[PDB]
Amino acid sequence: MDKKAREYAQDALKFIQRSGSNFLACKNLKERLENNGFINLSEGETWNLNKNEGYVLCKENRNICGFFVGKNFNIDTGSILISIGHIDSCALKISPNNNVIKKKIHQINVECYGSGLWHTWFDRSLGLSGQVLYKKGNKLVEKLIQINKSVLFLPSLAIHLQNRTRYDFSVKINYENHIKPIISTTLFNQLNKCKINTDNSYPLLYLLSKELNCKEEDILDFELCLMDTQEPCFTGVYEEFIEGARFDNLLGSFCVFEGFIELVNSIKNHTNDNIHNNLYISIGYDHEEIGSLSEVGARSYCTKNFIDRIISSVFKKEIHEKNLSVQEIYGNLVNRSFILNVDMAHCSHPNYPETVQDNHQLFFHEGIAIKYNTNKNYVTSPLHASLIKRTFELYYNKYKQQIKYQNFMVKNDTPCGSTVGSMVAANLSMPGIDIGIPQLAMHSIREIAAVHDVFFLIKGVFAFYTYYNQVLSTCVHD
């Protein structure tokens, strides 16, 4: 696994450093799915879905959703298997009116998107990734940009100005005042000008026009996210960790789609009856960090309408002549359905032993977290994790490679952030689980994670895809 765990983390470290925002997360995953032969269908034309074919759609370039229709569906004995991991992170997005000129320094005022460690974003060689809408002729042209060179810097305050050396000197980052990255000075802005809107920064507008090869006056408005220009890398002495940026479920949703790609490649190659019996959906949501209340979030009707469009297009012919309905067929498959929500989990911090549960601890290379909660912030029920642990045991009987797992639970007094596990499980009425891999410094600009956990997560989504209905057929209720 040492070789396959490093090869899995290598491709994840090719995915991140190209996935600088939520837009290039949808773009690079759609490019990753189209390399295996997925038919890229748009939401706006018409859906004529076929058996045995895989499909992919970016809903308005924020929400990736790739699904694979099995060969023999059975309305009677079949399932809809969904793996979920949001494609976004806590980033400093750029405000619309950004022209801050203070102390002879051109600045951007950025909006803090999500709930992040914003003091870690201080003193970073920052870049740009996101979506820019610009004019070309009479047509609005949309381009996803990726500026991997350092063009922004959020400077900290020098230590000499406040009181020093005690209780970490009472550091307080005011989110409006102190979080405003510098981009240029007014000296070299005017020096690089002689060789229309006053709301956009001309150092910024010169930068995007250099990337898009147009005038700065053609740049209309943009949704840009600040990213750290430092490439992700294997760390530790033994090159045993991974870290670069955005590992809050951009590493995790890589394993959602890498586990989904290996499933479809296992279906298409070497062609055993129940693998062609399911609808395997793999959706990368947006706007998780702010609560999923969006048109492309988890609380959206997007996924629920996607399944009701797959059911209507696949079973187009059997609605008419045996008088079934969509909600009859959808509620028929919901009993055999499942949701595998993948989002990162808190590894046991060695420097903070007071924020960890005693029994439910997570360590690196120890396996997938299975995140439980008091208040169902994670949707894991002890029945529905027992089915997934038996999919990990059916993986061990066939591939002779153990998928390790470990139960994670936050302390009863401390609160924890909710995920999209129970959001989609309420929208789709499907049972669910919340798994993920342990990482340290979650919601920060650099997040460290283990490379064996990337192997266990990719095989963990693949084992849930392959062996869920083999476990579900053996469950007898009263």
Add this chain to the structure above:
Amino acid sequence: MDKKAREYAQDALKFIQRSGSNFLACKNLKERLENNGFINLSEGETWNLNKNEGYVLCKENRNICGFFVGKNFNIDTGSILISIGHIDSCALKISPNNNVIKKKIHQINVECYGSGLWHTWFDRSLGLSGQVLYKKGNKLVEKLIQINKSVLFLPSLAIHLQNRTRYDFSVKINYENHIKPIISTTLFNQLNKCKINTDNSYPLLYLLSKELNCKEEDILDFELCLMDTQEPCFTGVYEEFIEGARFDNLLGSFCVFEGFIELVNSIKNHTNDNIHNNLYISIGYDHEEIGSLSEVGARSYCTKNFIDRIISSVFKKEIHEKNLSVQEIYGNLVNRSFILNVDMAHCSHPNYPETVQDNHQLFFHEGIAIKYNTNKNYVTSPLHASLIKRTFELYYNKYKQQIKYQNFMVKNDTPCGSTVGSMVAANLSMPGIDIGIPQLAMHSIREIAAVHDVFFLIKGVFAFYTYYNQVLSTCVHD
């Protein structure tokens, strides 16, 4: 009513003391509905619904939903009448990794489910109820257990160790540290062993294996809730109250289904045109105490897909040949629809006169609460309570037994907990009301309530079922 109010509270006190958790709430209600002849249909086969027949389904053994299709539906003049009361309570559920050995004492670390008076759970002879998944051969066997003997104890701290006798000695229950029930000592665990997983407690695993008659190594994982082993009983001098446990809408949802059973028995017996004209649904939700964001909660798509499966299966033949749709038929019945959310309400505490409204007070044996709210935490609108108060008056004209009611409203400065009234009224787009019966010490391990209110609630759900369309036909808007 004295005889019928005690007989109603007697069967409720048979329902509780068998309903130790949310799983045995679904199980005993499904057994209570199947005794009247309800056709138990599963979500996974196919729905061929008939007129005049009653149906019942436990969605994955947490969410009970019993409905009765009337004899002559009318898409033009007909209704969907839903009564709602969640089947769950604030309980100490058992964590997955439970092996706490401290001070030579085997402990369970429990997770505080819901928002309860957890200091009342201290010093109780505690039992176990819930769902246990265990192996038998190669098959995962699911069993709902009920351990009515005291096998757990959450001990308090002795009074001598802190400061004493003033302002109740500054009692602070740390939810992680201090809430960990003892189960055994290491002396008698080792003494009862000589005559695989290290995460589960062997005193607990010996206990469940004794109930399931298998090895302790076959017990995989379980969703167990701690309950109080003391049986509920009639209290007061005149045997005029009821109390045992879990009366936060396990008594209330008993009256939802006992009011539903008496309706269906009134439809089947003595066979006046509008009683066969409606779809009477009675659903017992789960996960209310944590906010209903679950696959079996009120925010789920489960109930909305259930009605769209009833409409599709009952009107299977009229979709095809007059070209109606489900959402056309569902939105047609939503104008005549109603939601009767039943959850317990705060009786006027005599020892706390500063937490009560002056005019909106609730007293025992005074009637059903009709819970109003500022922020619509309760879904009661003053129009839609006026229709229900006229169903209580149509009950008085036929049965000559007055259904008493009283309006309940929390103070403007104090906040109150939201219920599932507005959650399902948003999911189903149906108008609603929040009724319930006054009880003291809500969300505690022992909750006292009045036996005349159990009579008024059972007749209150029955009067809403019988006489809503007779009231709704007499409403003239402009």
Add this chain to the structure above:
Amino acid sequence: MDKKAREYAQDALKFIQRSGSNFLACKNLKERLENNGFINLSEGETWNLNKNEGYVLCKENRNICGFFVGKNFNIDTGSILISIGHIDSCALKISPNNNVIKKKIHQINVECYGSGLWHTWFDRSLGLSGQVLYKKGNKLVEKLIQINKSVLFLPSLAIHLQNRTRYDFSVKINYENHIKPIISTTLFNQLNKCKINTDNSYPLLYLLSKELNCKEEDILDFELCLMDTQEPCFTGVYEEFIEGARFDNLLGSFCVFEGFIELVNSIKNHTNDNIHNNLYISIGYDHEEIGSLSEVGARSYCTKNFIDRIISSVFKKEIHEKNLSVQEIYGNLVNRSFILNVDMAHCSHPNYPETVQDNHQLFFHEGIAIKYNTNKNYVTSPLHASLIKRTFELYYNKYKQQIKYQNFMVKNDTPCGSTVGSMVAANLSMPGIDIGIPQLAMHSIREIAAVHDVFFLIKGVFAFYTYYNQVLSTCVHD
């Protein structure tokens, strides 16, 4: 010992559940002593005591004191062996003026007797035990009542009214305002009336008149204690603990008298010279929880006058003709005398590791506590515990059953509650020790204790009775 430890805890669990107060503690112990043949003598007639006979007296039905005069007393070489355990507990006693009618609910206002965990008394199916004085003809008739059905309930506040879910929601039990159990409503009080004093509650006066079979107007005044109606039971998985109520030295003083009964049965049966040489007194005190300043407390002259009445009646003939005095004879026997004070001790709480000493810890089934103190709140001196540990070793040489012990000491910074060890050791000028058995949640309504400790305590009082003068004869001072 497993069989004998369960048989000892079985009879203790027959003693408690009949011993609901301090009055029925004196009554049931006097019935327990009279079954072995103890001559019940009253304080008011005349004391003609005999050798070889056992006597028992309830001083005004609160203070039990059973003693056994040995066959051959020796003023020269003889002793007075006293075992002490108070018969009372922290209970909610009923106030004289109890007519609280607030929010249409009949209430009792109760007085908090002792220093108890009064938040554990909330939400309990509460009963009544105590002494009721009522008229019958022209004669004041005294009756000890025991109402084992739930007739009272102290309700808590619902969780929704205050702030929630943090630091246990700032629970504060005001001892006057919030501790007032409900007993009835004014609806069913008036409903059960049509089918003189305004200070007594008519729901209460109807209840006691139903038990005494007289009019409510004959009930004059009463000393009633609220008790929990739940019967004590063996708990744990292995049925290894005991808990029901009042285990603060009503379990402990059971072992005082059960150890005393087994002594007298060892003296009368199998009839070796020094067992008939002592005055074995076993006294159950009252009013310990409030500081023993009473006519039946430990600070009373009752015990000191009892010994001076035993010495005067046994040695009635030798005072006259060799010109001895009572204080000469009493101070002669005080040098060989001992006091075995038995009161419960704090087991090491697993959920509170900051309130325990590191070295002096108490665990369940580990033996008798031997409670030491800094300030002599416990009367244990390291000389006088060394004699008792040698009585435990002389028990092991004869019966081949080890009496385990463990030293208990509270932390130096924390204070601990004083016992009646040093109170009676000052009143009688006898050396003493404070032993007891470890229990959790002392001074609460449910207190858990171990069943092997009940065996060790009963054999511990019996070994002090049998083998103290064999140890005391081997002590050589300088």
